[PDB]
């Protein structure tokens, strides 16, 4: 009863089966619930009892570090086989809530306790038969969810033989009662179908998929069936990296045991505790990285520190690399209105002359980030987009998802966009206007959240790109989709003898540095390198690889820039200068899109220098970016009337 290390020939599922050692274990956890001794000595578990009875939330959480510190000899006996230790502990919680609150007995009982913060986390690929019936903490992104399903759990049948109605029965997917051994002392009689004596039980199934952050080119994804019972219902949403703890238990069917010889052999996971993570990843980072990033940010040249590291394979096009780094942050989608939710994402649309390698510039941002996908044009359509029917096996209804839902708060990469069908380009506007989709199928509506940044690469119609035509007409695209991006910086390659000496010199220097034979003395042999850093166009040293990893998981989830009221009225009268001058030669005027978008690039650059509020130095460098992209969409002949006139605005810093 006292010593637990002497099992005396017993196993794990046998020593805790009787009521011997259970006397001391039950009395220890029962007295600890009312007497909580934390750091300074504040009994907070007593107040949690009165909080769970207000909204009828039968989910009492408890920290694992508290139970592991007070009882050092019990931190290992719990993660052994907690399949039966948590079921018997639920009866102990009922003796505490009813002892002090007698009015709680009016509501239903059987309070399922919870447990958070586990010291072990296993990925969804290393679990086989060795982790069977083990409470393992496994995370993963949610693919799709199911609504209310009337699970057949208890059906009444009117009988007349001994004045005893047959029931209750067991027909749920957890356990059933096969004919031949009835629980009512093996009795059977006449049956009668009813119409209002059927009480169904809640039942939902969740699809679990691997995280796209650890998916490489040349691997096949795997699926996982997640079965959630009562209590924890509608706690997760499709396309959201959350965390759900459960037991890796097998599947016990009951519908194929009457005709087939082998039942459904599958390994699922039950429900025990959920944890919606976003904000907890930045709080669990290291400490030595926070000190080294502040010593390098004191210099006034940190703006070009990340611009010279984007795509170190192709030299040139400095204006293109500036738009790729600003679009990685995506801004801060806030609510500037009073009833309308205005989106706040930086959408960049690239379209160049086929021959300058436009797709290689996108393959670099997907490897230095934390979540990024890649699709084509003919490989998807209106079905494989965001949501699309049923499960034709045993009369079921389950909605699915596409690729934009699972890519939450990330950077999406779409290749071959100009060759897309006409019926597909007019159906993507719903996802890039509210960051949510309302699926109205089978009379069940459910809203979610999908934060994405559309980054596409288009091509001109037919042959090559002609600068003599407008960008809105040179590409085979509709007009409502063009007025939804922000950065339209495009380039045109041509024969230039004054700059062709750096292109042929940079491709031959990176050909040897990026060679597998050269990596034996550089990557394999630490402390040696054949070629140093390439001469950039600003004299700033680039960044390796580990710098960009710990950069977006800290600055994006720490400082939140607000909206001040500096000299913002100067842009009001300045906008009227170009509004009544664009049609004076031959150009379209500036709409209201360039006015509300100034806040996007203002908070993006302030996050680099770690500014709590917006500064005038950020709003000035944002005007030169929106103007250089609008002039590339008109005729080259009218460039002398817009650049020479507005020369004072295109020359800051």
């Amino acid at each position: 009863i006292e010593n637990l290390e002497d099992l005396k020939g017993h196993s794990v599922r046998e020593w805790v089966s009787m009521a011997g050692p259970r006397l001391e274990i039950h009395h220890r956890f029962k007295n600890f619930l009312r007497t909580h001794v934390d750091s300074h000595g504040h009994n907070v578990f007593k107040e949690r009892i009165s909080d769970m009875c207000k909204e009828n939330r039968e989910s009492l959480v408890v920290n694992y570090e508290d139970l592991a510190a007070r009882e050092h000899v019990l931190a290992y006996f719990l993660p052994e086989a907690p399949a039966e230790l948590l079921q018997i502990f639920d009866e102990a919680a009922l003796e505490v809530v009813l002892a002090m609150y007698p009015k709680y007995d009016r509501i239903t009982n059987h309070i399922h306790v919870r447990i958070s913060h586990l010291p072990l986390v296993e990925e969804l690929r290393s679990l086989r038969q060795l982790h069977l019936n083990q409470l393992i903490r496994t995370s993963g992104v949610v693919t799709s969810c199911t609504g209310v399903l009337p699970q057949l759990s208890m059906v009444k049948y009117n009988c007349n033989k001994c004045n005893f109605v047959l029931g209750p029965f067991c027909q749920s997917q957890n356990q059933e009662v096969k004919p031949g051994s009835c629980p009512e002392c093996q009795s059977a009689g006449p049956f009668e179908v009813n119409m209002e004596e059927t009480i169904y039980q809640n039942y939902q199934r969740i699809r679990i998929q691997e995280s796209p952050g650890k998916v490489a080119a040349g691997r096949l994804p795997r699926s996982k069936d997640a079965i959630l019972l009562a209590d924890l219902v509608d706690s997760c949403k499709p396309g959201d990296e959350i965390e759900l703890t459960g037991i890796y238990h097998n599947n016990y069917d009951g519908s194929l045991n009457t005709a087939n010889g082998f039942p459904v052999f599958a390994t699922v996971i039950l429900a025990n505790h959920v944890a919606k993570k976003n904000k907890v990843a930045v709080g669990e980072l290291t400490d030595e990285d926070v000190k080294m990033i502040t010593s390098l940010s004191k210099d006034q040249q940190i703006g070009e520190k990340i611009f010279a590291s984007i795509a170190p394979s192709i030299y040139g096009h400095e204006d293109i690399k500036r738009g790729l780094a600003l679009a990685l942050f995506g801004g801060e989608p806030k609510n500037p209105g009073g009833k309308h939710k205005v989106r706040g994402d930086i959408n960049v649309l690239l379209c160049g002359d086929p021959g300058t390698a436009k797709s290689q510039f996108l393959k670099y941002i997907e490897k230095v980030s934390s979540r990024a996908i890649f699709t084509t044009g003919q490989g998807a359509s209106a079905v494989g987009l965001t949501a699309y029917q049923r499960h034709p096996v045993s009369r079921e209804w389950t909605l699915e998802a596409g690729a934009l839902v699972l890519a939450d708060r990330g950077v999406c990469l779409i290749d071959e966009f100009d060759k897309m069908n006409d019926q597909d380009r007019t159906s993507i506007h719903e996802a890039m206007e509210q960051q949510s989709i309302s699926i109205s199928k089978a009379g069940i509506v459910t809203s979610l959240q999908a934060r994405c940044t559309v980054i596409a690469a288009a091509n001109p119609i037919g042959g090559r790109y002609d600068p003599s035509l407008t960008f809105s007409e040179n590409v085979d695209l509709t007009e409502p989709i063009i007025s939804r991006f922000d950065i339209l910086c495009v380039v045109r390659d041509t024969v230039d003898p004054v700059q062709d000496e750096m292109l042929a010199r940079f491709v031959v220097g990176s050909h040897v540095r990026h060679h597998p034979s050269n990596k034996e003395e550089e990557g394999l042999a630490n402390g040696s390198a054949a070629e140093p850093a390439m001469p950039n166009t600003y004299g700033v040293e680039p960044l390796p690889q580990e710098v960009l990893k710990k950069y977006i998981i800290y600055a994006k989830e720490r400082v939140h820039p607000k909206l001040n009221q500096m000299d913002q009225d100067k842009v009001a009268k300045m906008y009227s200068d170009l509004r009544k001058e664009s049609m004076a030669t031959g150009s379209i005027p500036i709409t209201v899109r360039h006015i509300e978008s100034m806040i996007r690039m203002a908070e993006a650059h302030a996050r680099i220098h770690l500014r709590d509020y917006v500064i005038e130095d950020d709003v000035n460098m944002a005007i030169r970016v929106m103007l250089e992209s609008f002039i590339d969409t008109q005729k080259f002949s009218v460039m002398r009337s817009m650049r020479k006139t507005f020369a004072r605005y295109l020359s800051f810093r």
Partner: protein, 556 residues
């Protein structure tokens, strides 16, 4: 039976009498790993077992299904003498290294119980699924627990309970923490296109592996499963054990996956492959003598013979700084012949190189060759099926007649000559793979022949984005002189009159395939005196491109 017991006592002494390299047994180092309960490796070599006994190993491969439980109890007893092991985990025999290979078309009715090896390649991939092996039931009539319940190939239920009065003739109850399961995969193999000389009857065979045979099983593995065919209603299933991804059919054992030194490869290769690639690699016309010895039926035109040999090798798939592989393969295509003489250029490569396909314009729709997706009929789930570009990995795909085709097929293949990867996510099913297969296209003129009145861009149907992503572009030379038809006619007469006598090659086809693996061994480097020569030659083609002012025809 006493026959199966005799084959186990003598097999136990084989792990101690037959030595390996020095005075140690290769199974001694394997016993130290079996103590850790997460790895169960029991590799047994067949080429070394015949050295100690031959008549004893005959009944092992002839009757393997019956000696299946005897191998599990014999290896567990032998490892018990090495170190005491717990009595709560079983093992599995991993018999590999079989020099005898059987064809999928060579099968009868008594193939069960024969420990053989099947070739081929797998296309479809299924997730893991457990299997009830050692379970525990419970009688619902007398409330008695019955242990030691082994499930073979049917629903083995205890017909007689512990109480000799009554029994449960219905169903039982599956135990929870007292049931050991073994996961497996139900993959779908497919016949290889390089082993079907006659007859085109495609089919598949059920292959089931063990627990530790997972992980290394993705859509595009050309491995050869090893095991024993098991008969199930009444179906067929090949119970495999281990995997070994090697070259198609036979070939070598090293390409672009495993790297080693130069002293360990000489001990495995034959002696006849040393002096053949040593004295012949020091010549000056090695690049030219291999062009005529391979194409004896092609007279003249040295621009098409020097590009096909470099097509097999070409560049190498390097790695950039961030860890992203770009290009690494050469592409070429010819135009200027209405499918009258260019058809022989694709046939000589199909017969020679086994990693090659052959299709026409209308024979390839939108998908099919890339990645086809279709809902399964006996599972009702969106699966991903590989195409022809995924099976010919690190090779070359052939395609003729680039005119009789739509525009949707060219868009889906734009990521093949520039990125060499397949990224198709259709229906929320991710399927991002990669394939280093070069496109051996063959453009065809609009009016059949090259029109001298029209421009050079008005006779072809290829646009600018298609030619920009493509590499080398050749055009068949057309000469209307009296000496062109006078020289090509002499080669046709010598071929149709002297059957199997006009070939006068200096190197046979047996040594050409041997020199294909030596190129992928020592990777060449870049000298320090060549960086100044490349920067001065690109400016020449830069002015050659702009014949008029800026743009012209081919963009470089």
């Amino acid at each position: 039976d006493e026959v199966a017991e005799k084959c186990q006592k003598l097999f136990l002494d084989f792990l101690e009498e037959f030595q390996s390299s020095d005075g140690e047994i290769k199974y001694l180092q394997l016993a130290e790993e079996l103590i850790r309960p997460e790895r169960n490796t029991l590799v047994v070599s067949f080429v070394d077992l015949e050295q100690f006994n031959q008549q004893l190993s005959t009944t092992i491969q002839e009757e393997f299904y019956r000696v299946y439980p005897y191998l599990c109890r014999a290896l567990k007893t032998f490892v018990k003498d090495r170190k005491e092991i717990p009595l709560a985990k079983d093992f599995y025999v991993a018999f590999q290294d079989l020099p005898t290979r059987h064809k999928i078309r060579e099968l009868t009715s008594s193939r069960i119980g024969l420990l053989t090896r099947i070739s081929g390649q797998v296309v479809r991939t299924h997730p893991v699924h457990p299997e009830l092996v050692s379970g525990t039931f419970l009688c619902l009539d007398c409330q008695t627990v019955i242990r030691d319940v082994e499930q073979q190939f049917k629903y083995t239920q205890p017909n007689i309970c512990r109480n000799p009065v009554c029994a449960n003739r219905r169903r039982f109850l599956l135990d929870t923490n007292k049931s050991r399961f073994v996961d497996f995969q139900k993959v779908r193999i497919q016949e290889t296109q390089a082993e079907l000389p006659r007859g085109s009857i495609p089919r598949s065979l059920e292959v089931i592996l063990r627990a530790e045979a997972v992980e290394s099983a993705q859509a595009g593995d050309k491995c050869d499963f090893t095991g024993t065919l098991i008969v199930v209603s009444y179906r067929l299933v090949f119970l495999a054990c281990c995997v070994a991804p090697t070259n198609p059919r036979f070939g070598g054992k090293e390409l672009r996956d495993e790297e080693q030194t130069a002293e360990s490869i000489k001990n495995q290769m034959t002696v006849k492959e040393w002096e053949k690639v040593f004295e012949m690699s020091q010549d000056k016309n090695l690049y030219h003598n291999l062009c005529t010895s391979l194409f004896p039926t092609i007279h003249g035109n040295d621009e098409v013979k020097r590009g096909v040999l470099l097509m097999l090798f070409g560049g190498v798939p390097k790695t950039t700084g961030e860890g992203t592989s770009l290009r690494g393969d050469i592409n070429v295509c010819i135009v200027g012949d209405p499918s009258t003489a260019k058809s022989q250029f694709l046939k000589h490569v199909e017969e020679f190189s086994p990693r090659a396909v052959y299709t026409s314009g209308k024979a390839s729709s939108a998908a099919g060759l890339t990645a086809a997706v279709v809902r399964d009929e006996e599972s009702h789930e969106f699966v991903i099926e590989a195409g022809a570009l995924m099976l010919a990995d690190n090779g070359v795909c052939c395609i003729d007649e680039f005119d009789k085709m739509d525009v949707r097929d060219q868009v889906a293949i734009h990521e093949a000559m520039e990125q060499q990867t397949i990224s198709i996510t259709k229906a929320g099913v991710k399927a991002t793979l990669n394939a280093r297969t070069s496109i051996l296209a063959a453009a065809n003129p609009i009016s059949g022949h090259y029109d001298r009145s029209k421009s050079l861009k008005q006779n072809i149907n290829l646009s600018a984005p298609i030619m920009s992503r493509f590499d080398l572009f050749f055009i068949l030379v057309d000469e209307c002189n009296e000496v062109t038809d006078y020289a090509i006619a002499r080669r046709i007469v010598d071929l149709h009159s002297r059957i199997e006598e006009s070939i006068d090659r200096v190197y046979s086809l047996d040594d050409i395939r041997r020199y294909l693996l030596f190129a992928r061994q020592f990777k060449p480097k870049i000298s320090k005196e060549s960086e100044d020569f490349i920067v001065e030659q690109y400016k020449h083609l830069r002015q050659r491109d702009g014949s008029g002012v800026t743009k012209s025809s081919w963009r470089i």
